[PDB]
Subunit: 122 residues, 4 copies
């Protein structure tokens, strides 16, 4: 799956996820969001299961973006948790958590939840 | 918050989170879970907002563990998304998503959600 | 949207959501799941915003099923939280939480998270 | 657990949850939020497992509030998904999803996720 995961992915929002999968389970790359308080590329790092099951199961993985770069700081971080599913129409199916820095009074409303589906075309 | 985040953290379950914060926004270290299909330490990587707001808000961060090491492989990955809050009773307040690799028939039940509070003592 | 919400809805798994929207903001009906520890219909109840914004926003709603009926008891409950979007291809876009009754030792793993999209055809 | 669940509950934010558990698995009552775009009481409805496991497990339940009443309309709905744990320090441990009505361009940011713990005192 190192080969499978490594490359350029796109989600349903038109965001771009550029990733390299290391032999050691590492994910490194950049994320470009089409929405929200974001412009240009942000560093991402993550992990994946480098010895997945042989029973037709997907490959668990996840990664993080902190929404600071040379242009903008959105004082937030998203984590994607999902699985990679190989084959002619390869997908990464994720759910995510976006947390903002907040005061203790607003901490109840700190975290958004959603879902992103990444494909190799779009 | 580089100083504040770097070190050993403990959650409500007895898990141990050993992290270094980089000047560049990186998180690197190891995670040892007190529960589930886990033994010994697992690599983690993540990101944090290295220039947080000065209005008394927390510092957004996240990280990932893939549940594979030299002892076990749980074919799963957890991402934590949260904020660091400083001061004498410093805390990392997180929500997490744990995704298993599944077949497509079982993909609806792939992902658990929970919440973990990390402190510097116990 | 009382008229628009009331009726039979189908999700991407083949599940059947039969609902009546009350003028008072009540949702009542039955849920038949195509997957998991379930057979036949289960009672559902919920609420919706009966005076939504007129700026082209969706209508917020949610409901609960407890997975007990005369055939089976899965010792669990799912809540759907979402919005109704009207028009030619009407949808209810939801995220859900499924909690099982658990011992205190397994309560970290009590809750699944997912997402369901309901349409009037399928 | 009909008797255990029925009554007045309070969460860590100082919100008030007034519920009646029906023999039929119904939950009905009122919710008063101490935070957000809310004042006074809101209708709630939900479900619980009225025949839980006898092995020490918690009792699965969930409920919904639509944030409209005679005073305000926040064009939103929260669903709590959780379990009732009986005894001298009785608890309802929940995770919640708050969904706002949005335009389709803001729908990625429609949903908050958090966690509330309800006790009989405070």
């Amino acid at each position: 799956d190192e080969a499978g995961i490594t490359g350029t992915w796109y989600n349903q929002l038109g965001s771009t996820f550029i990733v390299t999968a290391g032999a050691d389970g590492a994910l490194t790359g950049t994320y470009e969001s089409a929405v929200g308080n974001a412009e240009s590329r942000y560093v991402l790092t993550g992990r994946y299961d480098s010895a997945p099951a042989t029973d037709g199961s997907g490959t668990a993985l996840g990664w993080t973006v902190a929404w600071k770069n040379n242009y903008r700081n959105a004082h937030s971080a998203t984590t994607w948790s999902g699985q990679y599913v190989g084959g002619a129409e390869a997908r990464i199916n994720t759910q995510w958590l976006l947390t903002s820095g907040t005061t203790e009074a607003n901490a109840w409303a700190s975290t958004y939840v959603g879902h992103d589906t990444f494909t190799k075309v779009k």
